[PDB]
């Protein structure tokens, strides 16, 4: 049958983790992520308008860009050992 009698036969799993995005959308036979398209260098364009909200620039941790913005507003504190050395460069 098509209904209740055939849902017992579903015990095979096809998608696994991806290395780059972290979602469970990496096909193990086609060898390609269905969300980020992993083995290619460039990332995939998302499917809808709401999909650009979910992982944009700024919902993360921003380990580096938090620093770069902070030197724009306030000046950078310098190391005095490094400051004396750069004046001795030719």
């Amino acid at each position: 049958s098509k209904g209740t009698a055939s849902f017992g036969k579903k015990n095979k799993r096809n998608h696994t983790l991806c290395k780059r995005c972290g979602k469970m959308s990496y096909h193990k036979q086609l060898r390609k992520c269905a969300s980020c398209a992993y083995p290619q260098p460039k990332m995939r364009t998302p499917g809808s308008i709401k999909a650009r909200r979910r992982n944009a620039l700024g919902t993360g941790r921003m380990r580096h860009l938090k620093k770069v913005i902070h030197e724009h507003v306030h000046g950078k504190k310098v190391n005095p050992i490094l400051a004396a050395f750069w004046k001795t460069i030719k």
Binding site: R13, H15, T16, L17, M24
Partner: protein, 51 residues
């Protein structure tokens, strides 16, 4: 199923740790006097999707 890879075990250990009620030493504080956890799950109701 007693035959796991490395990634499946490391993800499964972390998912066991996060299913816990609030400890009793924190509940005596004024902040958490009546507050309780809402993100608990049951092992028979909802599945974890780890594969």
């Amino acid at each position: 199923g007693s035959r796991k890879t490395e990634i499946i075990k490391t993800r499964l250990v972390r998912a066991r740790r996060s299913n816990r009620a609030i400890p009793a030493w924190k509940s005596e504080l004024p902040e958490f006097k009546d507050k309780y956890n809402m993100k608990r799950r049951h092992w028979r109701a909802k599945k974890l999707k780890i594969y």
